[PDB]
Amino acid sequence: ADTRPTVRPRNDVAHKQLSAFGEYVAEILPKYVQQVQVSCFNELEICIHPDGVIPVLTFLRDHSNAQFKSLADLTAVDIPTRQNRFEIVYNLLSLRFNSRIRVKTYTDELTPIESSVPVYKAANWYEREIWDMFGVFFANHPDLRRILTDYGFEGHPFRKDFPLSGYVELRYDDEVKRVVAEPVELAQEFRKFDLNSPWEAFPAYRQPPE
Amino acid sequence: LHHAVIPHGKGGRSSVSGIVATVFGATGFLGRYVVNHLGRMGSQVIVPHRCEPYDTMHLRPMGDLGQIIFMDWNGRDKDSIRRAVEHSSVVINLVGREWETQNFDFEDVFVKIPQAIAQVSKEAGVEKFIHISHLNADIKSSSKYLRSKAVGEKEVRETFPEATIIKPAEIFGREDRFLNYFANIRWFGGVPLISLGKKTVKQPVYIVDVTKGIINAIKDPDARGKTFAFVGPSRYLLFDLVQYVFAVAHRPFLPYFEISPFEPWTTRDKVERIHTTDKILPHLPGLEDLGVEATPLELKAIEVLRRHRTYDVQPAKTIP
Amino acid sequence: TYKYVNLREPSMDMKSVTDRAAQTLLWTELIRGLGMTLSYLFREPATINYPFEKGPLSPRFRGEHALRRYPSGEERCIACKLCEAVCPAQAITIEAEPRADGSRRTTRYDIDMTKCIYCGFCQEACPVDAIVEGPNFEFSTETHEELLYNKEKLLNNGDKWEAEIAANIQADYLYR
Amino acid sequence: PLTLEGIKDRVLYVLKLYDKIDPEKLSVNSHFMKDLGLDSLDQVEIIMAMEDEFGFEIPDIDAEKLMCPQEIVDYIADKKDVYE
Amino acid sequence: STSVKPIFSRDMNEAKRRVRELYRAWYREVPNTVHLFQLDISVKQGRDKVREMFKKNAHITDPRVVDLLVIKGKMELEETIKVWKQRTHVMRFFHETEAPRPKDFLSKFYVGHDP
Amino acid sequence: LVSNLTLNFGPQHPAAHGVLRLVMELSGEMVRKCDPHIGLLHRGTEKLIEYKTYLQALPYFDRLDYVSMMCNEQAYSLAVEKLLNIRPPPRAQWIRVLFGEITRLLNHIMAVTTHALDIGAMTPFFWMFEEREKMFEFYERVSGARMHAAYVRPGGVHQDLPLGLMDDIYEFSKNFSLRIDELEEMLTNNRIWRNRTVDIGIVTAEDALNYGFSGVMLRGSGIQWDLRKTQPYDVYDQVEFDVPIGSRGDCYDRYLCRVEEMRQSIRIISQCLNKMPPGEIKVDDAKVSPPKRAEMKTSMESLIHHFKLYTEGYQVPPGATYTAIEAPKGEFGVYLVSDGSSRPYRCKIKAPGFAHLAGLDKMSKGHMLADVVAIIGTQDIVFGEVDR
Amino acid sequence: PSSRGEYVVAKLDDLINWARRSSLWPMTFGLACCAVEMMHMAAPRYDMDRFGVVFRASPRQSDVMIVAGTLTNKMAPALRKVYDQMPEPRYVVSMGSCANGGGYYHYSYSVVRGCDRIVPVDIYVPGCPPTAEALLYGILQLQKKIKREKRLRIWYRR
Numbered sequence A: 001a002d003t004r005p006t007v008r009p010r011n012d013v014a015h016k017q018l019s020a021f022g023e024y025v026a027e028i029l030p031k032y033v034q035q036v037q038v039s040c041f042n043e044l045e046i047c048i049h050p051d052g053v054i055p056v057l058t059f060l061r062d063h064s065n066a067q068f069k070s071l072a073d074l075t076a077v078d079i080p081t082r083q084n085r086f087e088i089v090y091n092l093l094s095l096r097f098n099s100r101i102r103v104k105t106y107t108d109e110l111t112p113i114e115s116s117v118p119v120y121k122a123a124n125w126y127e128r129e130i131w132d133m134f135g136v137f138f139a140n141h142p143d144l145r146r147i148l149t150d151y152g153f154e155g156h157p158f159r160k161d162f163p164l165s166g167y168v169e170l171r172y173d174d175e176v177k178r179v180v181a182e183p184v185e186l187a188q189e190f191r192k193f194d195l196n197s198p199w200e201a202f203p204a205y206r207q208p209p210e
Numbered sequence B: 001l002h003h004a005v006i007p008h009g010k011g012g013r014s015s016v017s018g019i020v021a022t023v024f025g026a027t028g029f030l031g032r033y034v035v036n037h038l039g040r041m042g043s044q045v046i047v048p049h050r051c052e053p054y055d056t057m058h059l060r061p062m063g064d065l066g067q068i069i070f071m072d073w074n075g076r077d078k079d080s081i082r083r084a085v086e087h088s089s090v091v092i093n094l095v096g097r098e099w100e101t102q103n104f105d106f107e108d109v110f111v112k113i114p115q116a117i118a119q120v121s122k123e124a125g126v127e128k129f130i131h132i133s134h135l136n137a138d139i140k141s142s143s144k145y146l147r148s149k150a151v152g153e154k155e156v157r158e159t160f161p162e163a164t165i166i167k168p169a170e171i172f173g174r175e176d177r178f179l180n181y182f183a184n185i186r187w188f189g190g191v192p193l194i195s196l197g198k199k200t201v202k203q204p205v206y207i208v209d210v211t212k213g214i215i216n217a218i219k220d221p222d223a224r225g226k227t228f229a230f231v232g233p234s235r236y237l238l239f240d241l242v243q244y245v246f247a248v249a250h251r252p253f254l255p256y257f258e259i260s261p262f263e264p265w266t267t268r269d270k271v272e273r274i275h276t277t278d279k280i281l282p283h284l285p286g287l288e289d290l291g292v293e294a295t296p297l298e299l300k301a302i303e304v305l306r307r308h309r310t311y312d313v314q315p316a317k318t319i320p
Numbered sequence C: 001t002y003k004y005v006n007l008r009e010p011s012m013d014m015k016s017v018t019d020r021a022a023q024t025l026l027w028t029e030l031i032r033g034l035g036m037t038l039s040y041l042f043r044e045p046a047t048i049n050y051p052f053e054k055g056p057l058s059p060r061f062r063g064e065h066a067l068r069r070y071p072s073g074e075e076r077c078i079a080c081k082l083c084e085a086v087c088p089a090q091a092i093t094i095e096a097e098p099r100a101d102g103s104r105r106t107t108r109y110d111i112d113m114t115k116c117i118y119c120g121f122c123q124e125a126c127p128v129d130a131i132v133e134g135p136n137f138e139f140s141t142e143t144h145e146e147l148l149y150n151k152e153k154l155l156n157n158g159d160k161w162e163a164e165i166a167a168n169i170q171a172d173y174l175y176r
Numbered sequence D: 001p002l003t004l005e006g007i008k009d010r011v012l013y014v015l016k017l018y019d020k021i022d023p024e025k026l027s028v029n030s031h032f033m034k035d036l037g038l039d040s041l042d043q044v045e046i047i048m049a050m051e052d053e054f055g056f057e058i059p060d061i062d063a064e065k066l067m068c069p070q071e072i073v074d075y076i077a078d079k080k081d082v083y084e
Numbered sequence E: 001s002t003s004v005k006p007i008f009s010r011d012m013n014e015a016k017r018r019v020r021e022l023y024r025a026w027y028r029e030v031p032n033t034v035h036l037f038q039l040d041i042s043v044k045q046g047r048d049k050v051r052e053m054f055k056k057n058a059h060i061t062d063p064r065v066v067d068l069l070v071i072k073g074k075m076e077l078e079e080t081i082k083v084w085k086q087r088t089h090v091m092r093f094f095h096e097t098e099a100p101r102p103k104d105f106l107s108k109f110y111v112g113h114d115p
Numbered sequence F: 001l002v003s004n005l006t007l008n009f010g011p012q013h014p015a016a017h018g019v020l021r022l023v024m025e026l027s028g029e030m031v032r033k034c035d036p037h038i039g040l041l042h043r044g045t046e047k048l049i050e051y052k053t054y055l056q057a058l059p060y061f062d063r064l065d066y067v068s069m070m071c072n073e074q075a076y077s078l079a080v081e082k083l084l085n086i087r088p089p090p091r092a093q094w095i096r097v098l099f100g101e102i103t104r105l106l107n108h109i110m111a112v113t114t115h116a117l118d119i120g121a122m123t124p125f126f127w128m129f130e131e132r133e134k135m136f137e138f139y140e141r142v143s144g145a146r147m148h149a150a151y152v153r154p155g156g157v158h159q160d161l162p163l164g165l166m167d168d169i170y171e172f173s174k175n176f177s178l179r180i181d182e183l184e185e186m187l188t189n190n191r192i193w194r195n196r197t198v199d200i201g202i203v204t205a206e207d208a209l210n211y212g213f214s215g216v217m218l219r220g221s222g223i224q225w226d227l228r229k230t231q232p233y234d235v236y237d238q239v240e241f242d243v244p245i246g247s248r249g250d251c252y253d254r255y256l257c258r259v260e261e262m263r264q265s266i267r268i269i270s271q272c273l274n275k276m277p278p279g280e281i282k283v284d285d286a287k288v289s290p291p292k293r294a295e296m297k298t299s300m301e302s303l304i305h306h307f308k309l310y311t312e313g314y315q316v317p318p319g320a321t322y323t324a325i326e327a328p329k330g331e332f333g334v335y336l337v338s339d340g341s342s343r344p345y346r347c348k349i350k351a352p353g354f355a356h357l358a359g360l361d362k363m364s365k366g367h368m369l370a371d372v373v374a375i376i377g378t379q380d381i382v383f384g385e386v387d388r
Numbered sequence G: 001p002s003s004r005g006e007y008v009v010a011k012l013d014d015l016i017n018w019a020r021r022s023s024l025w026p027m028t029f030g031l032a033c034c035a036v037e038m039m040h041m042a043a044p045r046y047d048m049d050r051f052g053v054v055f056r057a058s059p060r061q062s063d064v065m066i067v068a069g070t071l072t073n074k075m076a077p078a079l080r081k082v083y084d085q086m087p088e089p090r091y092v093v094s095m096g097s098c099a100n101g102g103g104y105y106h107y108s109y110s111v112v113r114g115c116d117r118i119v120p121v122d123i124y125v126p127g128c129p130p131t132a133e134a135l136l137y138g139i140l141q142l143q144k145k146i147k148r149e150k151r152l153r154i155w156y157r158r
Ligand SMILES: NC(=O)C1=CN([C@@H]2O[C@H](COP(=O)(O)OP(=O)(O)OC[C@H]3O[C@@H](n4cnc5c(N)ncnc54)[C@H](OP(=O)(O)O)[C@@H]3O)[C@@H](O)[C@H]2O)C=CC1
Pocket: B024, B025, B026, B027, B028, B029, B030, B031, B050, B051, B074, B075, B094, B095, B096, B097, B098, B104, B109, B132, B133, B134, B135, B167, B168, B169, B170, B171, B177, B178
């Protein structure tokens, strides 16, 4: 807390607790946890080897000091610049201790991740979505299939290399008396504005030379 | 070609083809496919009409934005005709009726109206033109529909000597009034009354086949001035067809309606065309010439009468 | 701090029970339900008479985009493309060339009233208060093409309503 | 009822139905891979055709060996269990 | 190194098994599909189309990929079996309305720019 | 499985919650399984936002839950503020709270009424919707748009409240509580309503946590959890209101909880009007808050910052975060990811109705077919955010 | 009595054109935010029912369809199916901006860029959402559009 209305007041106490709670999980499951980091806005991050999805998520759900009962969110972040392009992310809640932790893995198109449905029933559908939109496959999922896209969508939309306008646009044809599909044609193309400023914005995050 | 009509795109819905087509009597069964095919590739289309604008709505999805226009006109007037054809790269005449009214008899829709359109196109300097004649045209023919038709085939060949007159045989399709004519009209509430349909030979054609032919004709530069007829690939007998129809339609069969207001059904003169034989004209170029293959009636008769079929059928025997 | 919503214990005294027994066999609470409805019958309906009356609006209301002119008459827009670059739906198209007298002005200016989301960003980003949104909203059309407003249509609307657009902006430019 | 000869009969007739197979080269011991020279995909349809013809299931792993019409006769021997 | 986690099939010999298992699944379903949706193509046409999509993937070699291609097929079939799809979705494999796209060189040079 | 039926809401009835294609597996009269299909409204919002500026993307969050608009924008705003490392001015935090409660009134009125519309109870739909109309004006008189205000933005709000508004919101609040008492006089004590939502869709406390429920679903079965009390964001730490808690777990309690939350909103508004402070409405950091037109048309720096913030937007520090709020329906949050550019890299939207719908299968076990009407309604499912 | 053929047609044609517009039973497609306004338009303030426009009607006994909200590719086939089941006359009214040209989602792969592709629209109502009053203007406008129909006259002049 400080007397500056245009800045965000830091809460260091909660930040210290996460760092203290940091090694707590790094020591307990060192077979999987690769990297644990804490962000300045009080959010804990745990980096786990993909195999340890069940050992780590199952632990926090039930341990006597984690007690993360509810799964807040489950998604993936496509990143085509890495060998493991995709990157799962689990957001966990803890009513007892009133805190949230984020657990991340890494996979690709052809390396499935064990379904976490056994750990949480919440991920019954979130795992369908990730497969549906990104293409990652989940092993042992009770029922894996498309949840969002249209039937027979020959592609995985949310991948960064999937054009925004798709590949086929529908229309109704009288000759055949049924909706049809054709290669996409746009009356007006999507204008692609270039916004990046050519001057370094934040020196703190500067990536060192190569 | 004009600067604004140069081809552009990939021929999809919003691609520009360069064919500013003006279709007369597009509201009919044949037209809606021609409009749809023209709309498919995005060609500019003007559609004069006489009925309520409500009746033209179903054409709207068939065209992109600003590609379909719904003017007004009247056959008895030529001032209206000129507006719709002032800047058309081609003009198509599809007018016609299966019965006569107290306003426009057979001659008016088959002679003057086809002509009046032809002259204005010449006056306006239309570069091309298409005309739908009937395969069985002959001034000595019995069917006044045909006798009236036979007159039109001459003036159109005279007023617009380069107009590609086309003479298709009986056409069938989803909305056709030939296959649907036998199934419902002939039988419903009435036992078949075929007058010894043993000598007649009928060689109908598929509507899609005709539609593809017309477009190919527009593109071709050498098709100017010629004359074509479209006929299915397999000939048939009238009696054989009706019997086979009830197999697909699964209606009871027993081998062997007046003229009123509204749209009459089973008109006096319409009969003559059902009995009238399909002419054999081996010398006139047909569908196969337009890069179009006739689709056998066996393949496509299933869809049209599927609705007639309430809620493993040997195809009809052919006659050489 | 919480509270309990459904935790009442029915006292088992005869009188209380007789009430819950009285309620069932006499439908009293249902008779009460017919009461509230009866009252609303004799109230005054909140129905206004359209189109002879209108629903109250505010100066900030957002409606049909329009293009303004200075008091002299000149176009306010100077083709700065801020509105295009911010319209979230990319419903704005703009072109400009130096006019005869060498003044930056538009040549093609189009708003797609079907791609528009009526967000008000365009009037926020205009540095000269050229493109605004008038208080009009009754502009439904029978065809899609009519709802594609180009420069000529927008200018006419601005001239058409300018007697009111300024009146609203006058009362409200201070909050901005 | 058993007619181990019948097995030799229908199988030859059935493969006649398969349009790809030329009748002339068909034989009780014709070679699918080289004589007929069909596709491994095609022979799956044949196996399915036999299932309907003989009216019972045929495992896939077995089907990846019945490369000649005889083995349809031979393999079906144990399944039918006809010991002429 | 090539140490990679497999999905279902540890080698092509097992992987190719499900392909033949899958092909029968379609091959026996096309007759149902035509009647279920009341399509207007003979049972023969569907299987011929089915072979094409299987055939175009003959060049595949990766055990994982074939597992993936197979995994999609079951979903496509399951929707078809359960009638989750609709008459429209079934015919999207045949491309009726699409007019013949030219493919030889001189055809392209007369119509547009696409190579 | 005996006879699976594709119960469809595609021919949508007057409920205005979306279009739902439902595939079930009955056993005679009783339902035995369910399988909602939710792709029917997936527009791809989560993908377009990757092409917009953080400012341009704001209107999308308005169209996720199209009955809890300003609450949605607040959820997005907090996420950007958190990554920007700046705080909105104290006056802004009250305005946003002032409308969060008003929005929560809007949401519940839709939820309770339509939930009663589906069960044939039709009169309560209108009475309360009239108040929705009056509340729309407050939306309209501040932002000029009846529903999709986009009033709340990263850094506070856009325009200050007009004169005579707070003095008119007070008028609405004062008489409002009489409106609810009329509503309860036909739903709570009515025996027909009780027969439909008591012992129906009972959710066990442990399961609610496991499936990932939040909001009136969690608090409808005893669980004491409300992010307005444990993790306050703007000013909720500086107001007094009692989080209602049910015990039975059936639908009836959730109906009671929602009606009780609306009353607890009035107890808050009464405190927002009296405690509203003076000052500016947006962060006085021009690089994030575009200046008012007065300074833009007068000062040099004031113009440039109005020439970049409407063409390129504001850069955000690289990072990612998950921020959530007690939206009317339940927990709502976004996993925004920024890579340093003025456009978000990724934005996952945790729609509270997504989990509450997946759990419909669990809740629907062993209930008549007609009870799915009273089960879907009690969850307050709007398919705007289910599909996004 | 006396009257020419043209005159008697107009008056008895004027009747039906009045009946078919004084009593519209609109099917509603509440697909997105603009669904809410459709509810307000029926709410007490405007009371669309006061013009005879009833609130609910069986989709197979409708009189006009008001496409409200976005039209996803997945949901498109259902819309067309419903359209074909509407007995004639059937007037389709596009409501909002995502039901006209894709609105905010014009460039979304899974969005039908304008419902007009799937069906022929009669009245287009702009605004996302169109204020509950504007929508009412469209419905009133539609009745006039009906009032400018001359079926029988055209029939008498066939
Ligand atoms: N099945 C067949 O008969 C075959 C086709 N043809 C020819 O193809 C042409 C088109 O086929 P089809 O669509 O089935 O014919 P239609 O019966 O559907 O009529 C075609 C068009 O002509 C219009 N029409 C009728 N009278 C007039 C008039 N006085 N003035 C202007 N337009 C009028 C009709 O509009 P409205 O409905 O409002 O009157 C309609 O739009 C026919 O002319 C026919 O001679 C030739 C060989 C076989």
